[PDB]
Amino acid sequence: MDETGKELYLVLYDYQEKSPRELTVKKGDILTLLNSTNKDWWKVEVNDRQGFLPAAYLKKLD
């Protein structure tokens, strides 16, 4: 995706947003991390969109 040098996060499972701030994502999506100040809900970006997701849906790739 667009920007370079970013950590990549894999979405393990589909997630359907429960509020307008949240993201809807599909298994296999690749995300970047915008803000984590807790281990449970993160602000992330996928394909030009930004929103909140539960961190349990994500695996850091390395």
Side-chain angles (χ1 to χ4, degrees), residues 2-3 5 14-15 21 24 26 29 32 45 52 58 61:
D2 46 290
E3 186 56 25
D14 293 344
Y15 181 78
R21 79 218 162 75
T24 290
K26 295 310 181 283
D29 281 0
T32 56
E45 167 188 299
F52 289 92
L58 302 183
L61 293 183

Side-chain angles (χ1 to χ4, degrees), residues 6-20:
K6 289 270 181 173
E7 39 200 33
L8 298 187
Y9 295 84
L10 178 65
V11 174
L12 296 183
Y13 323 114
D14 293 344
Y15 181 78
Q16 173 168 354
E17 52 197 77
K18 289 286 280 193
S19 295

Side-chain angles (χ1 to χ4, degrees), residues 1-11 29-39 42-46 55 58-62:
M1 41 81 68
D2 46 290
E3 186 56 25
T4 80
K6 289 270 181 173
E7 39 200 33
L8 298 187
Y9 295 84
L10 178 65
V11 174
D29 281 0
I30 298 293
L31 317 191
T32 56
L33 179 56
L34 297 176
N35 189 102
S36 52
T37 66
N38 64 76
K39 226 198 156 26
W42 292 354
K43 186 172 192 78
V44 296
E45 167 188 299
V46 65
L58 302 183
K59 288 285 285 200
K60 190 174 64 123
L61 293 183
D62 61 45

